[PDB]
Prior knowledge:
Elements (H helix, E strand, L loop, with lengths): L1 H33 L9 H7 L1
The structure holds one DNA strand of 51 nucleotides.
Amino acid sequence: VKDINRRMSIGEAKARRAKKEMVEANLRLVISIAKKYTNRGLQFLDLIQEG
DNA sequence: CAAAGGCCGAGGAATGCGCCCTTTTAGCCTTCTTTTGTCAATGGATTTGTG
């Protein structure tokens, strides 16, 4: 059961690093979208973080 | 052999900005049970009437 939960953890770490790589790639997309809302009351970094 | 121009990117105002749908949450709105304030009786213990 140790090795079972271990292989589970291996899969989880792989998928998590993959999600990380995708988010890292598309941060530029998020900034490009958030630039459209920059003057409706919320600061720029807050827009980027919600995005 | 350089110049004009076509291309891409790095930076800003703003006439800029969701919709349709499911599901919970607030609160108002009625209906009912109970605590509470009220009107009337109904004697009963001092106050007065009497000589």
